[PDB]
């Protein structure tokens, strides 16, 4: 009866059902155009203490990471803000500074939006991006190797470091926090993905979770080798220092804003920090070190 | 220092350095990007039927697209829902959304949900046009038109704020005009053809006539006894002792159209009502200047 008593899958299965819509990172519309939306709500995604500028940058970067994962380039953006009437004007000004910087970087732009009073800060972004070839979650192919960009787990260690509310942090800890607060979309993988990926997508719910969506969505079965997983130096250090398993972070790190794509091994780029972690074969599910694994 | 002590937009557009911040026109043909927001406690109450709020989430955005001479194509709906919200509320919500999309002939291609203290509804819509009609194309010699009647949405919100158990029909028609408005998608062809200056009355006639006057360099002259008044508004007014005109001039959002073009071009099937003319170089009502 209540949204909470319904669970994860349950809610979306009803909406899609209600509308009877198979399209609910982006939605592909013809003209192609990639339509995307994301939300950052105070209390959940960030705190009012985090520098506004980084939140402004993130607002644009999250949407760009979805457009990018589908082989498209970010073009236009609509930013809707729910702000408490007693919010510092400087907060909003710094927020839009970060937004301007993200747009300058990714080469997209804000064209509109509106403001509404609210008990808490709610950030809702809309982004439109064009593509000459839609690359999604089903295109996988038998024989395909499985790659991921960058490293995994960083964003998770950073959120935990933030939750510790330390006064200051060591550098290795800062780089981790920055990866979670001011992430950079792999807009540098567009050419590669819009040209060689058979299957692609942004790792937003964590490796294991999204590799399933991948496997399921293309009737294929994926095999990943834990000791191939790209691990960063600060995640290693963070782990040793707070005694944890780097791997548990790479497999279940939630959103990392890195790409998870597939294509024949022959196509690795001489310039991208691409890392093969497994292979696409047979059919049905995802496996790690040989043992089936689920979220 | 604080938002209310501020005004704010002019600072944002600044920081971003934009002339662009009801639609933003980005051009082969033109795409019309628009966003609308409905927040519980402000735009509606959880006690209103969910289905109407759902229809309105789409309608508000379609009225803007319509106003610029465009047709609604794609929609993205993002919901901020409290985990304790009844599931039927969301289901009834999307029923109203599905109905609006079938009617206006556009669709929701996706969106994302988030947990929250209050129902926050954010909708994004994409439209298309052969020709963009804005708030600056007014032309000396143009008559000033509006669609439907004015002030209904205001009386309706006031009827709802009274939280009566039931209401006379005339009042129900008023309430529905505010809660389940219908975008003037029936004016598209006429707008996307004869409008030199169009726009959606979202802040009230006089307020948006300014934006019209100021943004075209022109000056507008409105006659109050030309303003289209619906019968239930009159009834409402006579009943609650108020001036129908004050409602027509300051009815806030009415989801109607305010457009301009030569009088020698009215349609034989649209409830178009001429209310003024375009001359000199501001806004006037019955010969008196008027400001929001």
Distance from CA of B140 to the nearest CA of A (A): 30
Whether residues A2 and B35 touch (CB distance < 8 A) is answered with no
Whether residues A15 and B87 touch (CB distance < 8 A) is answered with no
Binding site feature residues of A for substrate: 45, 255
What was the elucidation method?
X-ray
Same structural domain, A194 and A279: yes
What is the DSSP track for B76-106?
EEEEEE-TTSBHHHHHHHHHHHHHHHHHHT-
d(CA B250, CA A194): 52
B 59-98 near A (Cβ less than 8 A): 73-74, 76, 78, 80-88, 90-91, 94-95, 97-98
Whether residues B34 and A112 touch (CB distance < 8 A) is answered with yes
Alpha carbons within 13 A on the beta-carbon side of B39: 21
Token digits for B135? 């708030």
Same structural domain, A149 and A253: yes
For A110, nearest residue in chain B (alpha carbons)? B21
Using the Cβ of A30 and the Cβ atoms of chain B, whether some distance falls under 8 Å is answered with: no
Same structural domain, A172 and A281: yes
Using the Cβ of B6 and the Cβ atoms of chain A, whether some distance falls under 8 Å is answered with: yes
Same structural domain, B84 and B208: no
Out of B18, B83, B110, the one facing A27 most closely (by C-beta) is B110
- Determine if residue B186 is labeled as part of a ligand binding site: no
Helix ranges restricted to H, A70-124: 89-106
Question: A149-167 burial, b if ≥16 CB within 10 A, otherwise e?
Answer: bbbbbbbbbbbbbbeeeee
What's A7's domain CATH number?
A: 3.30.1330.10
Out of A21, A29, A87, the one facing B3 most closely (by C-beta) is A87
Cβ proximity of B141 and B220 under 8 Å: no
Contacts of B69 (CB under 8 A, 6+ apart): B129, B130, B131, B132, B133, B188, B191, B192, B193, B195, B198
For A99, nearest residue in chain B (alpha carbons)? B16
Same structural domain, A193 and A294: yes
What's A215's domain CATH number?
A: 3.90.650.10
Handedness of CA A50, A52, A54, A60 (dihedral sign): positive
Alpha carbons within 13 A on the beta-carbon side of A236: 6
Contacts of A59 (CB under 8 A, 6+ apart): A38, A40, A79, A95, A98, A99, A102, A123, A125
What is the DSSP track for A74-89?
EEEEEEEEEE-TTSBH
d(CA A277, CA A280): 10
B184, containing H or E segment:
none
Four-CA torsion A68, A73, A75, A79, nearest 10 degrees: 0
- What residues in A contact B73, CB-CB < 8 Å? 29
- What residues in A contact B71, CB-CB < 8 Å? none
Handedness of CA B245, B249, B253, B257 (dihedral sign): positive
d(CA B251, CA B184): 17
What is the DSSP track for B41-54?
TTTB-TTS-HHHHH
Q: Is B258 helix (H, G, I), strand (E, B) or coil?
A: strand
A 39-58 near B (Cβ less than 8 A): 39, 41, 44
* Domain end residue (candidates: B133, B157, B178): B133
Same structural domain, A118 and A20: yes
DSSP A293: -
DSSP B268: S
d(CA A13, CA A3): 12
* Domain end residue (candidates: B133, B154, B183): B133
DSSP A16: H
- Structural domains counted in chain B: 2
Q: How many CB atoms lie within 10 A of CB B102?
A: 10
* Domain end residue (candidates: B115, B133, B151): B133
What is the DSSP track for A252-283?
S-----EEEEEE-GGG--SSS--EEEEEEESS
Same structural domain, B258 and B206: yes
Q: Are strands B120-129 and B71-81 parallel, antiparallel or unpaired?
A: antiparallel
Residue B129 pairs with which residues in a beta bridge? B30
Cβ proximity of A72 and A26 under 8 Å: yes
Same structural domain, A141 and A124: no
What helix, strand, coil percent values describe chain A, rounded to 5?
40, 25, 35
Same structural domain, A192 and A77: no
Using the Cβ of A16 and the Cβ atoms of chain B, whether some distance falls under 8 Å is answered with: no
Using the Cβ of B26 and the Cβ atoms of chain A, whether some distance falls under 8 Å is answered with: yes
Category of A53 on φ-ψ map: left (φ > 0), alpha (ψ -120 to 50) or beta: alpha
d(CA B268, CA B242): 33
Question: A110-138 burial, b if ≥16 CB within 10 A, otherwise e?
Answer: bbbbbbbebebbbbbbbbbbebeebbbbe
Handedness of CA A56, A61, A64, A66 (dihedral sign): negative
Cβ proximity of B259 and B201 under 8 Å: no
**Residue in A1, A7, A9, A15 to test binding to B, most B beta-carbons within 10 Å:** A15
Could you tell me the end-to-end alpha-carbon distance of chain B, in angstroms, rounded to an integer?
25
Same structural domain, B32 and B128: yes
Using the Cβ of A17 and the Cβ atoms of chain B, whether some distance falls under 8 Å is answered with: no
Using the Cβ of A120 and the Cβ atoms of chain B, whether some distance falls under 8 Å is answered with: yes
Same structural domain, A24 and A78: yes
What helix, strand, coil percent values describe chain B, rounded to 5?
35, 25, 40
Question: A181-194 burial, b if ≥16 CB within 10 A, otherwise e?
Answer: bbbbbbbebbebbb
Whether residues A19 and B94 touch (CB distance < 8 A) is answered with yes
Mutual angle of helices B50-67 and B169-179, in 10-degree steps: 60
Using the Cβ of B102 and the Cβ atoms of chain A, whether some distance falls under 8 Å is answered with: no
Same structural domain, B75 and B162: no
Category of B151 on φ-ψ map: left (φ > 0), alpha (ψ -120 to 50) or beta: left
Using the Cβ of B127 and the Cβ atoms of chain A, whether some distance falls under 8 Å is answered with: no
Structural domain harbouring A12: 2-135
Whether residues B26 and A88 touch (CB distance < 8 A) is answered with no
- Nearest Cα neighbor of B88 from B56, B55, B46 is B46
- What residues in B contact A99, CB-CB < 8 Å? 16
Cβ proximity of B185 and B62 under 8 Å: yes
Cβ proximity of B258 and B201 under 8 Å: yes
For A75, nearest residue in chain B (alpha carbons)? B26
Alpha carbons within 13 A on the beta-carbon side of B127: 31
Cβ proximity of A249 and A239 under 8 Å: yes
d(CA B35, CA A197): 33
d(CA A95, CA A235): 28
- Determine if residue B36 is labeled as part of a ligand binding site: yes
A154, containing H or E segment:
helix A154-163
Whether residues B39 and A118 touch (CB distance < 8 A) is answered with yes
Whether residues B116 and A122 touch (CB distance < 8 A) is answered with yes
């Amino acid at each position: 009866m209540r949204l909470k008593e319904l669970g994860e899958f349950g809610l979306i299965d009803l909406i899609k059902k209600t509308l009877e819509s198979k399209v609910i990172d982006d939605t592909a519309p013809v003209e192609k155009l990639l339509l995307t939306t994301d939300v950052l709500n105070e209390g959940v995604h960030f705190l009012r203490s985090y520098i506004p500028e980084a939140v402004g940058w993130k607002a644009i970067s999250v949407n760009v990471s979805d457009v990018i994962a589908n082989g498209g380039l970010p073009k236009w953006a609509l930013i809707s803000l729910n702000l408490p009437e007693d919010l510092e004007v400087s907060y909003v000004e710094r927020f839009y500074i970060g937004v301007k910087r993200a747009c300058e970087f990714y080469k997209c732009e804000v064209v509109g939006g509106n403001i509404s009073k609210s008990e808490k800060i709610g950030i809702s972004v809309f982004l439109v991006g064009e593509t000459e070839r839609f690359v999604g979650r089903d295109g996988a192919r038998l024989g395909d190797s499985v790659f991921v960009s960058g490293t995994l787990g960083d964003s998770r260690a950073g959120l935990e470091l933030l939750l510790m509310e330390k006064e200051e942090y060591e550098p290795f800890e800062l780089a981790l926090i920055q990866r979670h607060l001011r992430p950079t979309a792999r807009i540098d993988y567009v050419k590669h993905i819009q040209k060689y990926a058979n299957a692609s997508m942004d790792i937003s719910d964590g490796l294991v979770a999204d590799a399933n969506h991948l496997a399921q969505r293309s009737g294929v079965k994926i095999e990943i080798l834990s000791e191939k997983l790209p691990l960063s130096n600060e995640l290693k250090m963070y782990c040793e220092k707070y005694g944890k398993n780097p791997i548990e972070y790479a497999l279940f790190g939630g959103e990392d804003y890195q790409l998870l794509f597939t294509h024949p091994k022959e196509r690795w780029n001489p310039f991208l920090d691409m890392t093969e972690i497994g292979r696409v074969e047979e059919g049905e599910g995802v496996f790690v070190d040989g043992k089936k694994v689920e979220p």
